[PDB]
Amino acid sequence: SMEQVAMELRLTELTRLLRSVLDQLQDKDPARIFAQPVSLKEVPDYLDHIKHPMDFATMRKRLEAQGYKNLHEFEEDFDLIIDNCMKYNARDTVFYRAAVRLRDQGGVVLRQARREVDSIG
């Protein structure tokens, strides 16, 4: 149908906007602490601690399959990255600190993204 196509154009444009959001968030992680999945070879107990691991490469695979229906689902995954880290790592670690800084800096980007998504529909 023509409607399914219109719908698919909106999802594609949302994907376009979320790809830009993802790039902006990922720039706030210049150390690349959050770039890839925590290695289960190197942290073999990780899944005993963290039940839903997340990272930027995994979000990108979902994004490129148009697997985010709305900004809320995208933000859920970004929050997992931060929240998993702040639980697994202690406060005095470079990892915890990196998550706090990503959260704080990401807030600005996510604030305007929400306005853009509501605005453009």
UniProtKB/Swiss-Prot annotation:
Domain Bromo: 9-113
Subcellular location: Nucleus; Chromosome
Residues joined by cross-link Glycyl lysine isopeptide (Lys-Gly) (interchain with G-Cter in SUMO2): 41
Tissue: Highly expressed in testis.
Function: Scaffold subunit of various histone acetyltransferase (HAT) complexes, such as the MOZ/MORF and HBO1 complexes, that acts as a regulator of hematopoiesis. Plays a key role in HBO1 complex by directing KAT7/HBO1 specificity towards histone H3 'Lys-14' acetylation (H3K14ac), thereby promoting erythroid differentiation.
Subunit structure: Component of some HBO1 complex composed of KAT7/HBO1, MEAF6, ING4 and BRD1/BRPF2. Component of the MOZ/MORF complex composed at least of ING5, KAT6A, KAT6B, MEAF6 and one of BRPF1, BRD1/BRPF2 and BRPF3. Interacts (via PHD-type zinc finger domain) with unmodified histone H3. Interacts (via PWWP domain) with dimethylated and trimethylated 'Lys-79' on histone H3.
The protein, known as: Bromodomain-containing protein 1
Organism: Homo sapiens (Human)
Part of the whole protein covered: 555 to 674 of 1058
